[PDB]
């Protein structure tokens, strides 16, 4: 009877993929910031 309508199992499986993709997005963003800093320092 969840607010979303998802089962616990669905929520956990969804969360596991979300975390994986989010982590890769953040790693790529961190790399992008490193490169942009080498190209054009800020602060």
């Amino acid at each position: 009877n969840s607010i979303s309508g998802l089962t616990e199992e669905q929520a956990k499986e969804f969360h596991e993929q979300f975390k994986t993709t989010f982590t890769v997005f953040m790693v790529l963003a961190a790399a992008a910031h490193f490169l942009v800093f080498l190209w054009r320092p800020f602060y």
């Binding site: 199992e9 956990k12 993929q17």
Partner: protein
């Protein structure tokens, strides 16, 4: 209790469509990408050096 297995990407990528109904979301996805292309063009086109308008 239940612990989810670690997904393998890109092998498990098709499971996106088990969450996102492309009947609802494909056109919004394509419109979102179009908006990005318009915004990128707006920035680049605004530079006179990068636009074809030469007359």
């Amino acid at each position: 209790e239940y612990r989810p297995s670690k997904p393998s990407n890109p092998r498990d990528d098709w499971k996106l469509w088990l969450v996102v109904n492309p009947g609802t979301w494909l056109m919004p996805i394509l419109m979102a990408v179009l908006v990005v292309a318009l915004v990128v063009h707006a920035f680049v086109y605004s530079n006179d050096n990068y636009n074809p308008l030469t007359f």
